[PDB]
């Protein structure tokens, strides 16, 4: 499933992302932008360490899920790769907490760093009713 703007915004806020662990819900749209264009069904595979990202916020085979075919990786959200490929986002945004819980926060995705850090993302939620 594509997303539209305004309905992942409530969609994610329904989930409890608004504030989690101190991340605003402008932070988790422009994550999701960025990663995936607001796309569940978004892949990537990486080549060169022969993992591969998955969904709307193209969680790594490598440490958050299980795909069974990335070298040496451990799966600590405790799913299936294939449930970052649901339309329904629940299983998704529980990994994407599991990711914040980390030391890292929200910077665990570079795109994040890129994109969204240090910038003015109010114009993700504008008009969303949120």
């Known amino acids: 499933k594509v ?3 305004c309905e992942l915004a409530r969609t994610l ?8 662990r101190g991340i605003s819900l402008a932070n988790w749209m ?6 995936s264009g607001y796309n569940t ?4 595979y990486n080549a060169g360490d022969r993992s591969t990202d998955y969904g709307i916020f193209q969680i790594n085979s490598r440490y ?4 069974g075919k990335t070298p040496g990786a451990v799966n600590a959200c405790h799913l299936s790769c294939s449930a970052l490929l649901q339309d329904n986002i ?8 599991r990711v914040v819980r980390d030391p890292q926060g929200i910077r665990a995705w570079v795109a994040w760093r890129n994109r ?3 910038r ?3 114009q993700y939620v504008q008009g969303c009713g949120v």
């Open 30 to 35: 422009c994550l999701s932008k960025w990663e």
């Open 116 to 118: 969204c850090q240090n």
């Open 3 to 5: 997303f539209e703007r």
């Open 90 to 97: 629940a299983d998704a945004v529980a990994c994407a907490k």
């Open 13 to 20: 806020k329904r989930l409890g992302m608004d504030g989690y």
């Open 64 to 67: 958050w899920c299980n795909d």
């Open 41 to 44: 069904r978004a892949t990537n």
């Open 120 to 122: 003015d993302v109010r």
